[PDB]
């Protein structure tokens, strides 16, 4: 998303000309601009023919610039939806789907007739063997192996789909380089979240949120008052002398209407939804998108371990003597059973350092144990040397149980890692230590001050976990959440959600298992987990593609960024009208009231050029604010009053100063280039 | 003249706040349905005699009650003015009014505007000005305070449907707030020199030898509620500068205090009822900053008044044309801003004879919506629409949901707030546009050019915004002017009352969330400045072209 691809921009220029009134009817703020453009075009045609007196060139230039303005708004809106469609069908992974072989019985060896997508339904069984793209979503049954999940994640890292375990659900088409794994398609293609997202982006079904239609109500009210103010200038100035010409009235009207936010609102909504899609989170409704940023209490829940912390950056330095290739192989095999982002990033960095990737897990028939928060130490069981990894205290307990000791070199390396700032993780073969690896912190201190900033926003972060209470306190202390709740029954969880909703506060919940479905159905925001169940996925309304429960704060940030962008552009477009008056009003009344030149605060050239420069700026400001609408505003986490002060200081002063400079520079360019 | 004006504003605001805080404490009890101390015991038997049983009814029934009372008052006032000469207390045997003038000054007095396109000293009779004008001056004020009572109750009630009893509220207001204060104000006016009698007109043989006829009548009793209810319906043609109606500068000070009394009292009561006085402090600061700025601008523009006076042979260039002598230029400017921003039709100085810049600011305060200490209750629920727009915009700034006082403000309230904001500038612009095409509307002009357009715009905005202050040079006794302005007053009051009551009926159904740290503080200098900027920008971006073609053109000419 470089925001200006050549093919996207040229298809955008092709598709922006669809500006017929049947498509402009649903936007009144710019249907006013379209009607004014048509009216001034008819007026310019009449002046060129000679039916009415005039110059037939100033009105033609005004008409062309108003058409350029409506084309720029359609340019922005169609750019947003084109980027959304490009991201959606980039993350689409069905692709070829020309080989979907059948299976008779759930056992190795059956009729494997390869027929391309012969009406796959819920409850069917298919097979993939070393390269076959997954036909449809489902659960692996027997003999699961390592797959390259990239079409749904964006990373070429190997993730094992363990048969009969936590890594059971398969999502979309992917690359499989091992074989002999059977899956059962529990859903039909079309009702999945990927297919729903594709069907939602492929069309005009982009129904606005209630707060969006409230913003359009405000824009329509401003449109009505500005239309009345501009339309009533004909009698007021017609009594005082010659009447003000209609084209100046229409140009002043278009300069008055909040054209910026009125053309960028759909772009803001689609750009924010596409940004959350690029954050590995797929939603189903813009109402849920806004309600995500509208929450007050936040629930961070998973049925198994929680261990809130990313710690994505790593260094992978033993300083022992054993080579980093075998170190990375050891860490990858140990963390292949880990669904946490820390272990996932360990595997990612090991892969991008050395090309381990596929490891042929079915060679030794290793039994996999997942991460346990009560022990904070897990691995796999290939052979007698059961290779494993974990935290410092847990691995010290493990090595003292197995009859070993910490070498002074790895002790000094752990001390160096702790002094530099990280969580020391070390992989052990089961009988002899290999070397500690580092988990370098995310940006500044990570999850702790991110939760501090969220609490500075007045957002409650309630820890939900299923393990024992004693380890939950340590996990809460490591994370930074104010209060915790451990081994919560589903009835108590639903009661807590209804208790938080009883005071009116919105709630956001993460959930994986099928026991979280009654809570996610009645929760205001329900982000599902791909490590969980398809039942919970369908019960919720948003799906997390990274399998990370800590992405809820990023989703909240995006949902708040959309609203901040809407309000900032609305206030910018409202405040621009002061300089629009200071450019147009002293120049519109040039022959009616010649004394109205002291109001010309800017030394502009001519009345025929001041309105033209104002219209040029009103056209160009939409293009100049397309990158702002696509990116969102600069999000600075602060107290709500501080964010209000910063947004006012930026955007209100921008609306009160930038149009002055822009109109002055445009008029200066026109004078030095001789167009007027 | 720079320190005298500052001292005048300072002592006016100080005495106003000192007098208005206990009245706010009293009005909080009427909002909370708590009977006043001593009024209970007789209140129940009065309600039992009148047939009201304290039926807690919703917004639809409350609105129907207020509207039905107002149409009943309109019918009885129209019939009283039509059949005036059949009624008693007519010592001059004045004939009945024409249909256009009667309808105009009936809708005008019912809709709390009190536009006067006539001369009351030789147009209306004593019984008319006793029982059709004073009655409606009480009743329209009581209706406005009842509607703002409903709005404050809707803000303070948690998940209910009812909004109190309109008849009980009207009775409580006009028996324990209006009459007990208007009696003291009228008695003070009588002591200072205002008229209260029913003698016929006194023939006077002057010192020189000519003859003049002094008009009598119940002037002070009407004038007390005229000031208290922000009414502006004068007994005489000189609306509040007649020596029989405003005899003393002390009377003038009491007049200004009474005009800002009930708006400030209602702001204090709104602050008190929530239990958080910071909201009332926010509203009072937001009103007072704009009020002080406007008063200072008008005082300076009137001191730097007529430029031709200094070079035409006079002593100073001060603008004393159309101003009284017992009230100075500063006092007249302050009174002009007080009445014009407060939606009171009272004028001491003739606003038509003002400097262009010094008369633009009153008409600007008129056209921004009567929100700077505006109306009587009507200013307060005209202020809470700009407050709703401000909390919406600030909620989109901070990224949270738009809410105010713990209540979510949804799409329906945006619709109704937008319509209530739209209704009055639409009326001003279309009424002025209609008046500036018709020859019958352009033939009432007195001053030529941009000041004449300012006259037409001032009259239309006075009808639409329910102010009643007039550029008196306009001859608005024509049937076209009477019908146009009567329509403007009628729909400009009842297109603000209806959406505000619909907002109230939407707000009763919700419950207030707890004020957590995520909710922005609605008090504070930040939100006071944001609200001031919101109301100033909205009222300016819709009327800068009209001001530029009117008073700005006259000032720069």
């Amino acid at each position: 998303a470089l925001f200006e691809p050549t093919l996207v921009v040229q298809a955008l220029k092709e598709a922006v000309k669809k500006l017929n009134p049947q498509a402009q009817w649903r936007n009144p703020v710019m249907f006013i601009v379209w009607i004014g453009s048509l009216l001034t075009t008819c007026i310019s045609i009449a002046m060129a023919s000679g039916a009415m007196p005039g110059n037939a060139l100033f009105s033609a230039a005004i008409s062309g610039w108003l058409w350029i303005t409506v084309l720029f708004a359609n340019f922005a809106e169609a750019l947003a939806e084109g980027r959304s469609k490009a991201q959606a069908n980039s993350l689409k992974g069905v692709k070829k789907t020309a080989f979907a072989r059948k299976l008779r019985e759930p056992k190795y060896g059956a009729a494997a007739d390869k027929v391309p997508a012969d009406q796959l339904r819920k409850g069917d069984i298919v097979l993939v063997e070393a390269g076959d793209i997954i036909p449809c979503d489902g659960e692996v049954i027997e003999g699961g192996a390592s797959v390259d999940e990239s079409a749904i994640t964006g990373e070429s890292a190997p993730v094992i789909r363990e048969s009969g375990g936590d890594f059971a659900s398969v999502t979309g088409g992917t690359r499989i380089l091992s074989d002999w794994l059977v899956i059962e398609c529990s859903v039909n293609p079309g009702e999945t979240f990927l297919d729903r997202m594709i069907a939602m982006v492929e069309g005009a079904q982009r129904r606005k949120t209630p707060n969006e239609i409230a913003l359009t109500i405000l824009l329509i009210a401003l449109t009505i008052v500005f239309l009345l103010a501009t339309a009533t200038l004909w009698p007021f100035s017609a009594w005082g002398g010659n009447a003000v010409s209609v084209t100046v009235l229409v140009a002043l009207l278009v300069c008055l209407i909040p054209t910026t936010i009125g053309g960028l609102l759909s772009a803001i909504g689609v750009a924010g939804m596409s940004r959350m899609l690029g954050a590995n989170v797929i939603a189903t409704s813009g109402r849920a998108v806004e309600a995500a940023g509208d929450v007050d209490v936040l629930l961070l829940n998973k049925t198994g371990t929680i261990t809130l912390g990313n710690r994505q950056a790593s260094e992978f330095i033993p300083a022992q003597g054993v080579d980093e290739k075998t170190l990375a192989d050891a860490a990858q095999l140990a963390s292949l059973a880990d669904e946490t982002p820390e272990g996932r990033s360990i595997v990612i960095l090991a892969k991008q350092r050395f090309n381990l990737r596929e490891r042929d897990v079915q060679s030794l028939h290793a039994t996999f144990v997942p991460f346990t928060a009560q022990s904070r130490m897990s691995g796999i069981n290939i052979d007698n040397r059961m290779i494993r990894k974990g935290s410092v205290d847990a691995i010290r307990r493990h090595v003292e149980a197995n009859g070993g000791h910490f070498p002074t070199d790895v002790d000094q390396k752990v001390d160096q890692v702790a002094r530099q700032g990280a969580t020391p993780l070390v992989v052990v073969e089961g009988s002899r230590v290999l070397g500690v690896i580092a988990l370098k912190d995310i940006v500044k201190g990570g999850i702790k001050e991110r939760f501090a900033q969220l609490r500075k926003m007045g957002i409650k972060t309630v820890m939900i976990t299923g393990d024992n209470r004693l380890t939950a306190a340590a996990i809460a202390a490591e994370a930074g959440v104010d209060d915790f709740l451990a081994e919560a029954t589903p009835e108590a969880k639903l009661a807590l959600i209804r208790q938080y909703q009883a005071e009116g506060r919105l709630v956001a919940m993460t959930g994986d298992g099928t026991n979280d479905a009654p809570a996610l159905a009645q929760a205001d925001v329900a982000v599902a987990m791909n490590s969980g169940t398809q039942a919970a996925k369908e019960a919720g309304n948003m799906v997390d593609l990274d399998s990370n429960p800590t992405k809820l704060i990023e989703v909240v940030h995006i949902g708040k960024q959309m609203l901040m962008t809407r309000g900032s552009l609305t206030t910018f477009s409202i405040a621009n009208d002061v300089a629009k008056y200071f450019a147009i009003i002293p120049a519109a009344f040039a022959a009616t009231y010649p004394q109205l030149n002291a109001l010309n605060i800017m030394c502009l050239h001519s009345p025929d050029s001041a309105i033209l420069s104002a219209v040029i700026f009103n056209a160009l400001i939409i293009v100049f604010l397309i990158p702002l609408a696509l990116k969102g505003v600069s999000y600075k986490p602060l107290t709500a009053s501080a964010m209000l002060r910063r947004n006012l200081w930026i955007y209100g002063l921008g609306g009160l100063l930038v149009p002055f400079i822009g109109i002055k520079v445009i008029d200066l360019l026109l004078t030095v280039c001789g167009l007027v | 003249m720079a320190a005298q004006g500052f001292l005048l504003i300072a002592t006016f605001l100080l005495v106003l706040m000192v007098l208005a805080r206990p009245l706010g404490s009293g009005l909080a009890r009427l909002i909370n349905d708590i009977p006043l101390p001593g009024t209970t015991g007789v209140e129940r038997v009065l309600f039992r005699a009148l047939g009201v049983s304290d039926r807690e009814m919703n917004w639809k029934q409350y609105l129907c009650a207020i509207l039905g009372l107002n149409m009943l008052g309109l019918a009885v006032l129209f019939f009283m003015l039509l059949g005036q000469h059949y009624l008693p207390l007519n010592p001059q045997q004045l004939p009945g009014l024409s249909w256009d003038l009667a309808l105009n000054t009936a809708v005008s007095f019912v809709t709390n505007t009190n536009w006067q396109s006539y001369s009351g000293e030789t147009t209306l009779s004593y019984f008319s000005q006793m029982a059709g004008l004073t009655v409606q001056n009480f009743l329209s004020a009581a209706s406005g305070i009842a509607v703002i009572f409903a709005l404050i109750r809707a803000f303070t009630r948690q998940s209910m449907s009812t909004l109190g009893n309109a008849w009980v509220d009207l009775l409580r207001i006009t028996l324990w707030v209006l009459v007990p204060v208007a009696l003291l104000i009228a008695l003070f006016f009588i002591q200072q020199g205002a008229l209260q009698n029913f003698l016929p007109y006194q023939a006077v043989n002057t010192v020189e030898g000519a003859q003049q006829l002094l008009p009598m009548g119940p002037v002070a009793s009407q004038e007390a509620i005229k000031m208290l209810g922000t009414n502006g319906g004068g007994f005489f043609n000189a609306n509040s500068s007649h020596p029989f109606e405003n005899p003393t500068a002390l009377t003038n000070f009491v007049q200004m205090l009474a005009i800002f009394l009930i708006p400030t009292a209602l702001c204090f009561a709104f602050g008190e009822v929530m239990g958080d006085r910071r909201q009332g402090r926010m509203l009072l600061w937001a009103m007072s900053v704009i009020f002080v700025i406007c008063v200072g601008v008008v005082m300076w523009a009137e001191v730097q008044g007529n430029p031709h006076l200094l070079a035409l042979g006079t002593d100073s260039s001060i603008n004393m044309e159309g101003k009284e002598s017992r009230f100075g230029v500063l006092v007249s400017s302050l009174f002009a801003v007080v009445t014009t921003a407060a939606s009171c039709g009272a004028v001491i100085a003739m606003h038509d004879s003002f400097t262009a810049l010094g008369g633009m600011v009153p008409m600007w305060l008129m056209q921004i919506g009567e929100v700077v200490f505006g109306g009587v209750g009507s200013g307060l629920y005209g202020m809470m629409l700009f407050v709703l727009l401000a909390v919406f915009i600030a909620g989109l700034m901070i990224g949270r949901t738009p809410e105010y006082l713990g209540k979510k403000i949804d799409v329906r309230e945006m619709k109704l707030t937008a319509l209530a904001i739209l209704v009055t500038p639409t009326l001003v612009l279309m009424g002025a546009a209609l008046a500036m095409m018709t020859d019958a509307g352009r033939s009432a002009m007195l001053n030529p050019g941009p000041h004449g357009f300012s006259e037409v715009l001032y009259a239309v905005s006075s009808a639409a915004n329910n102010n009643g202050s007039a550029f008196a040079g306009l001859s608005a006794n024509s049937p076209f002017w009477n019908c146009l302005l009567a329509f403007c007053m009628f729909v400009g009051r009842f297109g603000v009352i209806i959406p505000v009551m619909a907002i109230a009926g939407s707000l009763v159904s919700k419950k207030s969330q707890a004020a957590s740290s995520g909710t922005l503080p609605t008090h504070g200098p930040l939100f006071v400045g944001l609200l001031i900027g919101t109301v100033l920008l909205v009222g300016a971006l819709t009327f800068i072209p009209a001001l530029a073609l009117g008073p700005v053109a006259e000032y720069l000419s």
């Binding site: 006013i32 009216l39 009505i224 009345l228 209609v246 | 799409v411 319509l419 095409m437």
Partner: peptide, 27 residues
Amino acid sequence: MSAGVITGVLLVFLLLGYLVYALINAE
């Protein structure tokens, strides 16, 4: 007044009615 004034008044009234309908029915 003339035909231009009449068609301008009808155009402004039509736009005002369309915007009022849009505000009443937020599609």
